[PDB]
Design a protein around this ligand. Structure first.
Ligand SMILES: CC1=C(C#N)[C@@H](c2ccc(C#N)cc2)N(CC(=O)N2CCN(C(C)C)CC2)C(=O)N1c1cccc(C(F)(F)F)c1
Ligand SMILES: *[C@@H]1O[C@H](CO[C@@H]2O[C@@H](C)[C@@H](O)[C@@H](O)[C@@H]2O)[C@@H](O)[C@H](O)[C@H]1NC(C)=O
Ligand SMILES: *[C@@H]1O[C@H](CO[C@@H]2O[C@@H](C)[C@@H](O)[C@@H](O)[C@@H]2O)[C@@H](O)[C@H](O)[C@H]1NC(C)=O
Ligand SMILES: CC(=O)N[C@@H]1[C@@H](O)[C@H](O)[C@@H](CO)O[C@H]1O
Length: 215
């Protein structure tokens, strides 16, 4: 996250860090005690039997008793198309269920088909680059835009300055009105161009598919 601020510790207890080889590589969202969702592009080209799913985290450089670590048992994807940057969504089934507490909570999703209009105020978050990787979870006020966005994305822009999501933020949730409306997918013109909206997988188009996977 470029140009944001520290989240309050455990402000977003659905926020997940996917790790490989002791390092964060993508964000994700806990959507049931035993399923996280992320971007398909994050797990394309990775050994998924090696991905560590970290719940309850805040400061990644610190040892945190609040953390709960899971392996991935299985993944599910619906038409992921890297060539057209479409359907950039994956559900990872964990090898167990999270203990649900103050630090670890299931996110709330929109109803299937719910569209966000131009100007809706959201919060993006993640442990991606600050412009230097982030140890502390960052969040950022963003605005939904329909300009320079296709139908197949939710897009957001920080109005008036250069700020947005960056490498390592992929897979992270976009929260609008308490609801997960996007999963961070791609940037244009580099991170925090000041011009191209950030693009998110549009979670609301996938809700019936998500529901049937999680039960
Ligand atoms: C990490 C990354 C890429 C990779 N690997 C990569 C990517 C690949 C596939 C999908 C899908 N479906 C989505 C993104 N990506 C887009 C990207 O690198 N390009 C866009 C497509 N280009 C054409 C000419 C083929 C090549 C360059 C990206 O912005 N990013 C990127 C960079 C910074 C932030 C973010 C995110 F998700 F936080 F927005 C994403
Ligand atoms: C579920 O997985 C947890 C984490 O497993 C660790 O990371 C994975 C990716 C492998 O490298 C594994 O060998 C590591 O231990 C375990 O700590 C936990 O016990 C597992 N839960 C089970 C098996 O019920
Ligand atoms: C910055 O964002 C703060 C939090 O945003 C609200 O809560 C998140 C979880 C989402 O539900 C989002 O849609 C909500 O707007 C706001 O409290 C604060 O007012 C914002 N400030 C500005 C200038 O946008
Ligand atoms: C999650 C969060 O902090 N939401 C806040 C809300 O408490 C507040 O009433 C409003 C002020 O505009 O901004 C938003």
């Amino acid at each position: 996250i470029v140009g944001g601020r520290r989240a309050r510790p455990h402000a977003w207890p659905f926020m997940v860090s996917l790790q490989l080889r002791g390092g964060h590589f993508c964000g994700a969202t806990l959507i049931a005690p035993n399923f996280v969702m992320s971007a398909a592009h994050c797990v394309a080209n990775v050994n998924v039997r090696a991905v560590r799913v970290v719940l309850g985290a805040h400061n990644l450089s610190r040892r945190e008793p609040t953390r709960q670590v899971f392996a991935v048992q299985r993944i599910f994807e619906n038409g992921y198309d890297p060539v057209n940057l479409l359907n950039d969504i994956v559900i990872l089934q964990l090898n167990g269920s999270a203990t649900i507490n103050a630090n670890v909570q299931v996110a709330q999703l929109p109803a299937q088909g719910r569209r966000l209009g131009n100007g809706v105020q959201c919060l993006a978050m993640g442990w991606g680059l600050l412009g230097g990787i982030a140890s502390v979870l960052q969040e950022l006020n963003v605005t939904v835009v329909t300009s320079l966005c296709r139908r197949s994305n939710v897009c957001t822009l920080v109005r008036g300055r250069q700020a947005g999501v960056c490498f390592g933020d992929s897979g992270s949730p976009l929260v609008c009105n308490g609801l997960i409306h996007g999963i961070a997918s791609f940037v244009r013109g580099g991170c925090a161009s000041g011009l191209y909206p950030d693009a998110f997988a549009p979670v609301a188009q996938f809700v019936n598919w998500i529901d049937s996977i999680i039960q």
